[PDB]
């Protein structure tokens, strides 16, 4: 008793909805987030509030970051779908969406028009995994490299073994989490290792090596932001801007940072937040040479905010310049 180490993930639920064949949908939940985003996933302990309030909570690691009440009338839940029913809308913590209840009429005729909306049990399960996929960069460390490392050797063998005597461990870590961060799958192992054997030896830096190897991914990156190849409304990056980060990056040459001047990275901020108003949703196209510090200097908000760059894109894609900055 008095173990050490706490437990990575667990579910607390009112029991009026509970047990209601909860497992087969989590089941089936985490067997598909492990195909679509690679990172496998630690189970699910579901834990019975004797309370009254209807509530749920989901902790992380002992410590709860998702927590809502569900009215008595809630049933059918829709998922910040259009605008074209809306039975009741919510807003849920820490910008993680929005969602909708609906009824049954208003249900029909949303899932007329190609949308998908859950009831009974399975709101639980789409629920649950959209709070996971904000915080999938948690379930990555030293620890879980090795699993997937281990499991590997099953096939790759003379692979890993021969990308071991050129890196740390500390630092495929290190470039697992740098790329999970930013929704990449990381399903494809191969590649990865493969790239990552190719440019070792030319580089000490994981925060360059993450780059050679995001840009090596072409296919599986635009696949997803833009099915059945549809043109991008695109956005641009002003030239002042772009030379401003350039000298700043190299104001210290080992750490590798960028001497920051934040009466610059405000109006920065600002500008591209109100220019997002616009509508203009993603694909912010920048240099190569500053997406890693442009994405630095934004992951503190707009998460799930595209940060591309012309070597990401084809030479054929098709775009669309919908805007472009001026600040200096």
């Not at 002003?238 to 210290?252: K, Y």
Request: hydrophobic share 45%; aromatic share 6%; charged share 25%.
């Amino acid at each position: 008793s008095m173990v050490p180490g706490a437990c990575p993930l667990i579910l607390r639920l009112s029991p009026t909805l509970h047990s209601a064949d909860l497992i087969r949908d989590i089941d089936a939940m985490r067997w598909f987030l492990f195909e679509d985003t690679g990172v496998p996933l630690p189970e699910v302990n579901i834990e019975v509030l004797p309370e009254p309030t209807e509530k749920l909570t989901v902790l992380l690691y002992q410590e709860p970051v998702f927590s809502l009440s569900i009215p008595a009338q809630a049933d059918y839940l829709l998922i910040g779908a259009d605008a074209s029913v809306v039975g009741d809308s919510q807003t849920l913590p820490n910008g993680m969406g929005q969602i909708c209840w609906l009824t049954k009429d208003m249900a029909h005729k949303a899932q007329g028009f190609g949308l998908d909306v859950f009831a009974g049990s399975q709101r639980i399960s789409a629920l649950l995994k959209c709070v996971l996929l904000r915080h999938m960069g948690e379930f990555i460390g030293v620890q879980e490299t090795r699993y997937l490392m281990n499991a590997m050797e099953k096939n790759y063998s003379e692979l890993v073994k021969e990308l071991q005597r050129q890196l740390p461990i500390n630092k495929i870590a290190e470039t697992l989490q740098r790329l999970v961060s930013e929704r990449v799958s990381i399903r494809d192992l191969r590649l990865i290792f493969g790239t990552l054997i190719d440019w070792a030896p030319r580089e000490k830096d994981v925060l360059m090596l993450t780059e050679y190897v995001r840009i090596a991914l072409r296919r599986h990156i635009l696949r997803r932001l833009n099915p059945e190849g549809k043109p991008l409304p695109i956005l641009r990056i002003g030239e002042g801007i772009e030379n401003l980060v350039r000298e700043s990056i190299r104001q210290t040459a080992m750490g590798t940072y960028t001497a920051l001047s934040s009466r610059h990275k405000t109006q920065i901020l600002q500008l591209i937040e109100q220019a997002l108003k616009q509508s203009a949703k993603l694909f912010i196209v920048t240099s190569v040479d500053t997406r890693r510090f442009l994405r630095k200097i934004t992951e503190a908000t707009l998460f799930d905010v595209p940060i591309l760059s012309w070597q990401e894109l084809g030479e054929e894609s098709l775009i669309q310049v919908v805007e472009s900055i001026d600040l200096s």
